[PDB]
Design a protein around this motif. Structure first.
Motif, PDB file in Angstrom:
ATOM      1  N   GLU A 121       0.621  -1.256  -0.023  1.00  4.60           N
ATOM      2  CA  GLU A 121       0.159  -0.020   0.006  1.00  4.60           C
ATOM      3  C   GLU A 121       0.974   1.361   0.016  1.00  4.60           C
ATOM      4  N   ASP A 122       2.009   1.306   0.685  1.00  4.15           N
ATOM      5  CA  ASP A 122       3.070   2.362   0.864  1.00  4.15           C
ATOM      6  C   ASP A 122       3.606   2.326  -0.524  1.00  4.15           C
ATOM      7  N   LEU A 131       1.419   4.157  -2.718  1.00  5.95           N
ATOM      8  CA  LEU A 131       1.496   5.683  -2.423  1.00  5.95           C
ATOM      9  C   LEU A 131       2.621   6.436  -3.044  1.00  5.95           C
ATOM     10  N   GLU A 185     -11.399   3.815   1.396  1.00 12.77           N
ATOM     11  CA  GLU A 185     -10.434   4.365   2.425  1.00 12.77           C
ATOM     12  C   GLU A 185      -9.014   4.457   1.771  1.00 12.77           C
ATOM     13  N   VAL A 186      -8.577   3.092   1.018  1.00 12.55           N
ATOM     14  CA  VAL A 186      -7.220   3.231   0.250  1.00 12.55           C
ATOM     15  C   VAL A 186      -6.961   4.082  -0.965  1.00 12.55           C
ATOM     16  N   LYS A 210      -8.822   6.744  -1.536  1.00 16.41           N
ATOM     17  CA  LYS A 210      -8.634   8.412  -1.081  1.00 16.41           C
ATOM     18  C   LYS A 210      -7.258   8.600  -0.365  1.00 16.41           C
ATOM     19  N   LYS A 211      -6.877   7.699   0.395  1.00 15.00           N
ATOM     20  CA  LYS A 211      -5.409   8.211   0.962  1.00 15.00           C
ATOM     21  C   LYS A 211      -4.481   8.112  -0.277  1.00 15.00           C
ATOM     22  N   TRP A 212      -4.637   7.608  -1.760  1.00 21.11           N
ATOM     23  CA  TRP A 212      -3.762   7.602  -2.651  1.00 21.11           C
ATOM     24  C   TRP A 212      -4.291   8.961  -3.461  1.00 21.11           C
ATOM     25  N   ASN A 270      -4.856  11.552  -2.389  1.00 16.53           N
ATOM     26  CA  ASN A 270      -4.338  12.725  -1.486  1.00 16.53           C
ATOM     27  C   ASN A 270      -2.879  12.521  -1.201  1.00 16.53           C
TER      28      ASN A 270
END
Ligand SMILES: C[C@H](NC(=O)c1ccc(F)c(F)c1)c1cn([C@@H](CC(=O)NO)Cc2ccc3c(c2)CCCC3)nn1
Ligand SMILES: C[C@H](NC(=O)c1ccc(F)c(F)c1)c1cn([C@@H](CC(=O)NO)Cc2ccc3c(c2)CCCC3)nn1
Ligand SMILES: [Zn+2]
Ligand SMILES: [Zn+2]
Lengths: 960, 957
Positions: free
Chosen positions: A350-351, A354, A470-471, A473-475, A477
């Protein structure tokens, strides 16, 4: 006054743009039936070539017969109304120094051959009938379906073929992209028979519906003048019928909305850990004068300071990255970012992703950069000015493909020259690299047992999941990340392209210009190609590179670690046409530097300096050592025939550490142990080098001494003694012996076999007996063992050379078990005895001339000449005039010479037969036609060491 | 009762472990005789010692006594066929030798036990009626001459004769005793001497029955042996000769307090300290000189050597009584010298007298004498059973010195302590009585004298009486202490009972990745002893010259470090040797099984935890540099054999390669080397003697555990346990390799006819052929053509391959030697056609006896097995199966084997020759064949690459 129009010709093209260094002559034209044509006149070429690319492929397979395009491709080799002998085409090529191949992609079926230049017309004639009058014989179709089955079977347990088709199976099932293109026995024979399809009629229908002249591009390269090439092409191809077939288009992407924001978890065959990130994009083909796709790929895939890869590597998460546009079909493309995963990386996918969106965001922030575009334009411009001259066979094929996509006058330049800076297009593509359009796939053994789906054609095990919002939207941003800087001016870009004048003492072959205890230097200033390039080859010898498994492991890890360290610095040079290679050998290390000579001495100095002063980073040591452990285990999943060839190397070489030994000696490699190894290895060395290119004798001595001086100053290197410069010998088999070594492949459900008939040390005599025999049996063995008996897709015969020895070797991958394949190879050998006896003297002289043309084929590019010389050097035979003297000797051989050779060395009953056979059993196995002779009981090798100890060792060949 | 026997001795005292039967007796003509009955011996033996030697040479014919000893081999009145003595022996599994000292001439032989009478008959005639044939007398003078030549440039013989030349010239001790062609021919001829008359005169005058002892060992009963010896030897004439005496010492007072500086051949540094002393032989029951030599020569803690070694002056020391002649003896203290020691000879000697002065202060110590007495007693009780030939020769020599009933025990069993004699000898060991010699190449060019016989360059000066006095006033040195009570004295001599599944050959009782352990409990000899043999295999022992140098220095440094501790054990019958090999390391521990585990563990632990003393490492490195250079002064035939070995083996570093690479060995480099070496290993071992299977497993386990704990040793892979192959030569090949010896003015040659791989058939073809030609070759090339003194023919075995080899050191050039060997080979072909079927069968039985000759002590049985184990053939029952096959061979099988493999026109001949030229040499008779133009080897590396390599031999079981 107006011209006289040939009616078979719709139009002649204008000047076809070429590199000024390209001395080949070109003409483009379109026939009356719409075939696009490029003629290439090259009055020096020893082989001629032609290719035809039909703009039709697997996406047009009927939905009820998967793989029909592919099967058709095969059947066209097997006879035509005007040339009904099933192997006419292959045989003709084989007997005139020719070869052929073909491939079926989604939208193209591409056929090509090369042949002695004095037989272009006869080869082209047999070729053209493929497109007018195939026979599609039933007996032929019933046999060849097995070749196609077997081709699919080689791929089934291959991870890249699995992932290739899994991508296709997770998009819109209603879309042709989802089709299975290879075919197999099920889809081409058994299912069709259950359904009452008559497959010979379906071939006839496809050929008629789609092999239309308006979807066809043809390329012909020969010695003949452009005007004679035009007549020849018109004569042979004017009669292909134009059915004005509309060209298939696929304008709806195979990944619609419900296929986005998905996550696939895949189980691999090898122990590999990969992350694949894919964005659907529009078809960028028509933008070839700007290439916005490649601008973004150049940046996102950069490996230098400030890049995405550099940060994921500092984090310990990834080692390699690929990034850029991926082809799809007319109407849709992809943009990818694939990386491989460390053990930590697998837990931070996931990171990782990102970070990719943070870098993409950096590019949106800075906007498009004309200077970046200027760099790519200039680099592509020099690459094309100074493009190496190609082998004709590959070249005709390549161009036939792209005549479909570009105006005649641009076929040569369209894929190299950039012309237009299009910041609008760059933004456009960049806007599609967004979390809402992403697809993610993770390949890891860690998903073993946790999958709930099975791809149908390969058996791939996977799971599918929506990516959580959720994932996403984290990306979406992703703020900026200051570790990410764009690249700066590439300092490695060359500017001195001057060609140094030929010195008054230059030599037709490399010369020994320095012979000391430390270094043996071979030199040749280029006298043929006149491009601003050079190749620098170094063999380093150390007894300690191979003394035992543990040391061999340390010599591997040292070079892997070293390359990893140099990689960010050297990436600039690689983009600028200056590349290097560094790999451990059974004698030490091989270093090779290739490309534009201008800045080569800078890169070479950096490499040697790194070698001599290397500071291992322990985080990198642990990561690379783990990857190496995997690499060795993963060998278990190579092809059965690849295994067979590996075991034979182990058996016949004096010393050979097996994968398993290596793997067992990889545990005891500690960082302190390695730190001590390097100075030891570097302490005594001998260096033998070939420097060959746009350099003078003075430059080359300076280069060599530069290397020496650097090793001496920083690693204290002193010369090895001559008595330490020993090479490994080949095992000497006993007259009349026959040994079999048997293993199992525990992944693939085919068997493999290599059969080695050892003859004698290499000499002019023995070399040409073997080679001419191999020419005579080449086609007949292929035609017997693969086309007629259908033993397997993979079927090979030819010479086998190692450690100054040689012999004849058969290689086969098959459904059937090794002992059976032995019979069949033996049955085949007997039949050659009668054929060679009955061959007329004219036919025999024909085979001599085929071999002669092949051996005197002169290299087209510098690195190909370099490799010819390098081989003479590495083998310590140093016989640089080998081709003239061996061909001269060939021309004196008689068929009675060859028959005596066969009856002394190869025949089953031959007094000096030396036969060893590796049998690799398939995963599930257990330990009319011509008559197979009766074979002695074979001695089974149970322990490679005892086998070698009990036999003598050949000498090493005497230098020249 | 019997007139021929003067006296019949009482029970001859023997060890209770000696199962041989003895009878002593004096003949009526005064010959002293010991008879030995051993019904199990395969070879019988006899020896005769005459108490006359070089010291009795005519003053005008130096060497006559020696020359005579050669001549007795060359025919008697009853057996006038010149080579009949040697030929009879050779055809009956036998051998012979002889030597001449200053007061003895000792002759011995051994022969198949079924032929003692025939052998002893021909032997007896040497002392009845030699022919001293003139032709033979003119040939054999050359053998004696080239015997002297091999010695001329040998540093031991030069110094030996130089001491003699520095004594009183009027004393017989100063005589040259070897003789050469000058003294035995050229000068006698020029002076009118009839040498044959002189030989006859010396023999009749001094080979008197009253000066002879005779020993005879056979399977016959003691009675039959008595009758045999009486038959053959009572005929000997008794001329009642007085035993020569030499009461005046050869070193008188102008010969004392003298200093000698001597230039060597080899680069060696040595100090010799000598004192003259009265003849101590009558004191043998108390042995004063040996008591003192035990102490002055001790190498343990507190010893003289220990302090000279710790100051970095000396590395080795020898001290004690040295034999002279009836009348005089010497006491010696000889050390080698480091570079520093050479600059400190004055202080070295001062420390010597400091230690002697301590022994005067403490006075004699009976407890010491008592410890020697008790150790010697144990030594004699469990003495290894001797080889017949060496045993008869030894005893015959000492029968002159001791009463019959005590001759076996006299040299072992000390009686009562005589401190008065000790203080007497000690009193002679004083500065005013010393002679001092220094040997160093540093005197080159600084000498002014030349010894006649050898050419030795030296200088003689008086020791300054200022220096004498400093030695006279030698204070006591606290660093010197008498030895402590030897804690390695064995006390458990219990022979463990034969285990119920004990095996007749060694058994593979453990087979892991790390250890092959071969075990046999002794079932023959039943002495309280065991031999423990370990091969440590490592690929880093020989990977390159630098690594080989480090494996050597490691083991030398380790031995050096262990030496003081291990001396006690060595005194107590427990010894070890530790040697680097081309595959790793060899460790052997031999002796009394009692405290063996204690020593073995100390060795293995010092190996696995070794801390190098920088100062030892410098000193041992320098010594090693020197020995590598000193190879230049070995003899030509020794060079020949070495080159051949550096050309037929796959891998082999030369001395120059090792020598160059030595400067690159640093202390840090060596510290890194050892743990690496030890990091991986494979141990193959033979444990054999007074031990149980469980005890063996425990020794092997102790060795593994010590390595695994301190050095983290892990096993090697099977595929790493590779052995070197021998170069395979081409059918009809002839190669020649030529080198020069810069020191000796003789040349050498080895000639190797490679046959094939070892095999039961090829082994016995080769051995039988060697047997058939053994004597004819020695007789032709040595006795008759007098090519040189060293002339050898036999099998060569290396790396599983074998052939036939001829070695010769001569004045003639090696090409000439090559043709004479080729000529011999032709004439052997006729000999074998002509040979009767009975002669053939004698040769078969002779080889059978030799091969089947079973071993007599543990060490020798151990070695036979160890040879199977390090050769990886493991054929422990080899002798029976090979001898069986041998008996089936026919003369025809041998002729065709010869014609196929060895003849000059053989289809499968494979011939390599090493020619070592003399220092100044340049690059009728039976006729030599014509020879091809030999391929000349210029480069061993190229030579090798261009040929195949043989296989290795398959193991047996
Ligand atoms: C490159 C390789 N040819 C050889 O090794 C070879 C060597 C010596 C000869 F004399 C000879 F005839 C062939 C090859 C290419 N293909 C196929 C490539 C492919 O896979 N399209 O999908 C194309 C193909 C399909 C069917 C047939 C042939 C070739 C040759 C005639 C028999 C039937 N299969 N094998
Ligand atoms: C030990 C060695 N014998 C052999 O190699 C040998 C091998 C096989 C035979 F068949 C054979 F006859 C001799 C040897 C010992 N000596 C001498 C030792 C020495 O030098 N005393 O001063 C003694 C000697 C002096 C003269 C003669 C012989 C022996 C033998 C017969 C010819 C004349 N010379 N050589
Ligand atoms: Zn195919
Ligand atoms: Zn002698």
């Amino acid at each position: 006054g107006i011209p006289m129009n040939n009616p078979a010709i719709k139009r002649i093209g204008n000047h076809i743009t070429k590199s000024p260094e390209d001395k080949r002559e070109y003409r483009g034209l379109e026939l009356a039936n719409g075939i696009k044509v490029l003629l290439i006149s090259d009055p020096t070429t020893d082989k001629s070539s032609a290719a035809l690319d039909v703009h039709i492929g697997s996406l047009s397979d009927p939905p009820n017969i998967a793989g029909l395009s592919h099967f058709l491709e095969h059947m066209l080799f097997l006879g035509t109304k005007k040339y009904p002998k099933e192997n006419e085409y292959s045989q003709f090529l084989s007997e005139h120094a020719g070869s052929s191949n073909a491939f079926t992609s989604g939208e193209h079926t591409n056929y090509y051959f090369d042949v002695s230049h004095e037989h272009l017309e006869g080869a082209l004639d047999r070729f053209a009938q493929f497109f007018l009058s195939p026979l599609f014989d039933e007996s032929a179709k019933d046999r060849e379906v097995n070749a196609v089955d077997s081709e699919h079977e080689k791929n089934v347990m291959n991870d890249a073929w699995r992932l290739f088709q899994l991508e296709k199976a997770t998009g819109n099932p209603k879309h042709p992209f989802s089709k299975f293109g290879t075919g197999n026995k099920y889809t081409l024979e058994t299912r069709p028979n259950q359904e009452g399809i008559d497959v010979r009629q379906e071939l006839l229908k496809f050929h008629s519906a789609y092999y239309s002249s308006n979807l066809m591009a043809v390329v012909v390269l020969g010695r003949e003048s452009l005007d004679d090439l035009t007549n020849l092409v018109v004569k042979l191809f004017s009669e292909v019928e134009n059915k004005n077939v509309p060209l298939p288009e696929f304008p709806e992407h195979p990944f619609q909305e419900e296929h986005l924001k998905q996550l696939y978890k895949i189980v691999p065959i090898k122990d590999i850990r990969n992350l694949y990130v894919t964005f659907p994009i529009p078809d960028l083909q028509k933008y070839y004068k700007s290439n916005p796709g490649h601008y973004l790929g150049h940046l996102i895939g950069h490996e230098g300071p400030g890049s995405l890869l550099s940060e994921l590597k500092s984090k310990g998460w990834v080692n390699t990255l690929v990034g850029g546009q991926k082809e799809g079909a007319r109407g849709f493309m992809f943009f990818i970012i694939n990386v491989d995963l460390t053990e930590e990386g697998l837990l931070h996918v996931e990171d990782i992703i990102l970070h990719m969106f943070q870098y993409i965001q950096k590019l949106r922030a800075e906007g498009p950069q004309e200077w970046v575009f200027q760099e790519l334009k200039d680099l592509n411009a020099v690459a094309f000015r100074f493009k190496d001259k190609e082998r004709p066979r590959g070249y005709t094929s390549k161009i036939a493909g792209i005549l479909h996509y570009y105006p005649l006058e641009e076929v040569l330049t369209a894929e190299y020259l950039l012309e237009e800076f299009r910041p609008d297009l760059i933004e456009m593509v960049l806007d599609k690299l967004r979390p809402e359009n992403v697809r993610v796939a993770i390949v890891s053994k860690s998903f073993e047992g946790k999958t709930d789906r099975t791809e149908e054609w390969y058996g791939t095990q996977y799971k599918q999941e929506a990516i959580p919002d959720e994932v996403i939207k984290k990306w979406q941003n992703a703020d900026l990340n200051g570790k990410f800087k764009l690249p700066t001016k590439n300092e490695f870009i060359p500017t001195n392209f001057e060609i140094l004048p030929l010195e008054k003492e230059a030599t037709p072959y490399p010369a020994l210009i320095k012979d000391t205890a430390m270094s043996k230097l071979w030199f040749k200033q280029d006298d043929k190609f006149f491009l601003p390039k050079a190749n620098l080859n170094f063999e380093f010898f150390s007894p300690f590179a191979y003394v035992d498994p543990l040391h061999s492991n340390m010599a591997y890890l040292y070079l892997e670690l070293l390359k990893d360290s140099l990689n960010e610095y050297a990436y600039a040079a690689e983009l600028a046409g200056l590349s290097y290679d560094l790999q451990n050998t059974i004698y030490g290390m091989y270093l090779s530097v290739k490309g534009y000579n201008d800045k080569q001495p800078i890169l070479l100095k950096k490499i040697i300096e790194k070698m001599a002063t290397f500071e291992i980073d322990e985080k990198r040591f642990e990561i690379i050592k783990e990857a190496y452990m995997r690499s060795l285990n993963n060998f278990r999943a190579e092809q059965p025939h690849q295994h067979a060839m590996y075991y034979l190397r182990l058996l016949m070489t004096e010393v050979a550490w097996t994968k398993d030994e290596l793997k067992e000696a990889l545990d005891d490699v500690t960082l302190p142990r390695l730190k001590a190894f390097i100075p030891q290895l570097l302490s005594r060395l001998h260096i033998e080098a070939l420097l060959h290119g746009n350099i003078t004798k003075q430059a080359a001595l300076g280069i060599m001494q530069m290397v020496e001086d650097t090793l001496i100053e920083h690693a204290h290197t002193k010369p090895l003694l001559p008595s330490q410069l020993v090479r490994y010998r080949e095992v000497q088999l006993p007259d009349r012996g026959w040994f079999v070594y048997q293993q199992r492949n525990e992944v693939h459900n085919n068997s493999g076999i290599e059969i080695y008939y050892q003859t004698d040390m290499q000499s002019t005599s023995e070399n040409m007996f073997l080679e001419l025999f191999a020419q005579i049996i080449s086609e007949p063995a292929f035609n017997t063992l693969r086309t007629k008996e259908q033993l397997g897709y993979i079927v090979f015969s030819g010479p086998r050379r190692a450690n100054g020895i040689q012999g004849l070797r058969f290689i086969i991958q098959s459904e059937k078990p090794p002992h059976y394949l032995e019979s069949r190879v033996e049955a085949f050998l007997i039949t050659m005895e009668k054929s060679i006896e009955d061959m007329t003297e004219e036919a025999f002289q024909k085979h001599i001339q085929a071999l002669a043309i092949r051996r005197l084929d002169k290299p087209k590019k510098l690195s190909a000449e370099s490799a010819k010389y390098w081989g003479e050097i590495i083998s310590q035979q140093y016989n640089f005039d080998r081709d003239n003297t061996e061909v001269a000797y060939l021309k004196t051989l008689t068929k009675e010479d060859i028959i005596k050779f066969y009856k002394e060395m190869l025949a089953v009953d031959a007094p000096r037969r030396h036969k060893v056979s590796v049998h690799v059993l398939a995963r599930e196995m257990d330990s009319n036609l011509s008559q197979a002779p009766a074979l002695p009981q074979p001695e089974v090798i149970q322990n490679m060491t005892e086998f070698k100890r009990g036999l003598p060792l050949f000498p090493l060949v005497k230098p020249h």
